[PDB]
Amino acid sequence: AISELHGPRLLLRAWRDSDREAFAEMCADPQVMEFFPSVLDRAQSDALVDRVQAHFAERGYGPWALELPGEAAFIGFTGLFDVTMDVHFAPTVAIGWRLAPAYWGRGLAREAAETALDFAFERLRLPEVVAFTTPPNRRSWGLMERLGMRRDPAEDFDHPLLAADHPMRRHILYRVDAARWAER
Ligand SMILES: CC(C)(COP(=O)(O)OP(=O)(O)OC[C@H]1O[C@@H](n2cnc3c(N)ncnc32)[C@H](O)[C@@H]1OP(=O)(O)O)[C@@H](O)C(=O)NCCC(=O)NCCS
């Protein structure tokens, strides 16, 4: 009983067991995982899918599996997740995305994110959605600003689930509120 969302090309849907093989391939891909501490093995990939499924069970939304009707069953994920960790901007709702590299450069993450944020603001009627990444991940924060999300560099933060001296600790924060989304 999970709400599926449609864009012109994409179906944002609940995860299926058949997704785990294709998602594990992505999580083992160094180009997909470049701006994360490590690639994941199958056990770690499956544990991430388990957390996504638990988010859907608890909240009725989550990082949707991305299907491309007419083309491919599974190309990655894009969607909303609740931020509960000890950061200055919590509690709030965030948006995240991970696409198989064959699908980059097609505006498919843009379309998935527009579909997810329409749901956030029209259906859930949330006041704001945030997103966060590392400065080197230019494809990721580039998508954030193209969506109309905006960054205050003063809100840069150290990720509280990484070591205080972790080389990838430094994150940047983007925000979009309901009014800014509507004004696009
Ligand atoms: C982050 C990520 C989802 C971005 O995907 P993306 O395909 O670059 O993003 P978009 O969907 O906005 O597509 C933009 C590109 O498509 C092009 N494009 C083509 N048709 C388009 C259309 N109809 N609409 C928009 N852009 C279009 C743009 O020109 C741009 O190309 P460019 O990068 O050469 O300038 C992807 O790179 C990824 O999965 N990265 C690895 C995982 C990751 O780091 N996730 C984020 C962690 S914080």
Author numbering: 9 to 192
Sentences reproduced from the published study:
Enzymes in the Gcn5-related N-acetyltransferase (GNAT) superfamily are widespread and critically involved in multiple cellular processes ranging from antibiotic resistance to histone modification. Previously, we determined the structure of the PA3944 GNAT enzyme from Pseudomonas aeruginosa and found that it could acetylate polymyxin antibiotics, specifically the 3-Dab residue on polymyxin B and on colistin. The canonical chemical mechanism attributed to GNATs is a general acid/base mechanism; however, mounting evidence has cast doubt on the applicability of this mechanism to all GNATs. This study shows that the Pseudomonas aeruginosa PA3944 enzyme uses a nucleophilic serine residue and a hybrid ping-pong mechanism for catalysis instead of a general acid/base mechanism. Instead, PA3944 has a serine (S148) in a comparable location as the typical critical tyrosine residue found in GNATs.
The only residue that could potentially act in this capacity was E102, so we mutated it to alanine and screened the enzyme for activity toward both polymyxin B and NANMO. Specifically, the catalytic efficiency decreased by one order of magnitude compared to WT when polymyxin B was the substrate, but increased by one order of magnitude compared to WT when NANMO was the substrate. Based on these results, it appears that E102 more likely plays a role in substrate specificity rather than in the catalytic mechanism. Since we observed a significant improvement in catalytic efficiency of the PA3944 E102A enzyme toward NANMO, we crystallized the protein to determine whether we would observe structural changes that might help explain the kinetic observations. There were minor perturbations in the positions of the flexible β3-β4 and β6-β7 loops between the mutant and WT protein backbones. The removal of the negative charge from the E102 side chain provided space for the orientation of the phenyl ring of F89 to flip inward compared to the WT structure 2. Additionally, the removal of the negative charge of E102 increased the overall hydrophobicity of the acceptor substrate binding site. The change in hydrophobicity combined with the conformational change of the F89 residue helps explain the improvement in apparent affinity of the E102A protein for NANMO compared to polymyxin B. When we examined the same docking studies but in the PA3944 E102A structure, we found the protonated NANMO in presence of AcCoA formed an H-bond with the backbone oxygen of F140 but the free base NANMO formed an H-bond with the backbone oxygen of F43. When we docked NANMO into the E102A structure, we found two additional residues that were located in close proximity to the molecule that were not observed in the WT docking: W105 and M152.
